[PDB]
Amino acid sequence: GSSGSSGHGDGPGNAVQEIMIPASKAGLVIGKGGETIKQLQERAGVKMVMIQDGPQNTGADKPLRITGDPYKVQQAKEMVLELIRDQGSGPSSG
């Protein structure tokens, strides 16, 4: 018949997403050196790498680079953003 089955040719690849993180909370999600953020990589299955590139003449922030997968990297991004995020009513007393 037609014998025209096309659709193939996707080598190796990795998804990456960058987000703005408040240096203030950065020390809470990263930890002393990066022990916390290290565990977050497994929770989402993606790699977390905080970028600095000497942030000069720019708003005080820390662009975090999350590499891994397109369907995963998207999940983690939320896990981190929610880490630095804050709400009105807090669960803890202190």
Side-chain angles (χ1 to χ4, degrees):
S2 40
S3 80
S5 53
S6 285
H8 43 259
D10 293 272
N14 289 114
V16 74
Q17 275 290 274
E18 286 195 317
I19 28 272
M20 304 184 64
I21 323 283
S24 289
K25 308 274 171 172
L28 281 88
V29 40
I30 301 167
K32 204 160 69 276
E35 281 274 90
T36 296
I37 175 180
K38 210 157 270 180
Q39 289 207 8
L40 281 165
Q41 294 183 26
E42 298 278 326
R43 276 184 193 164
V46 292
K47 209 175 162 285
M48 283 169 188
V49 176
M50 278 271 190
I51 318 305
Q52 313 313 330
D53 64 81
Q56 284 199 301
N57 316 353
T58 185
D61 175 70
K62 306 270 271 198
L64 158 69
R65 199 154 169 165
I66 306 187
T67 33
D69 269 305
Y71 186 104
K72 308 199 90 183
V73 170
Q74 51 152 84
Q75 305 208 313
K77 161 184 90 273
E78 297 277 278
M79 280 210 312
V80 185
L81 286 168
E82 192 194 38
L83 200 302
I84 63 90
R85 272 163 177 200
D86 89 322
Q87 288 201 254
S89 210
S92 65
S93 201

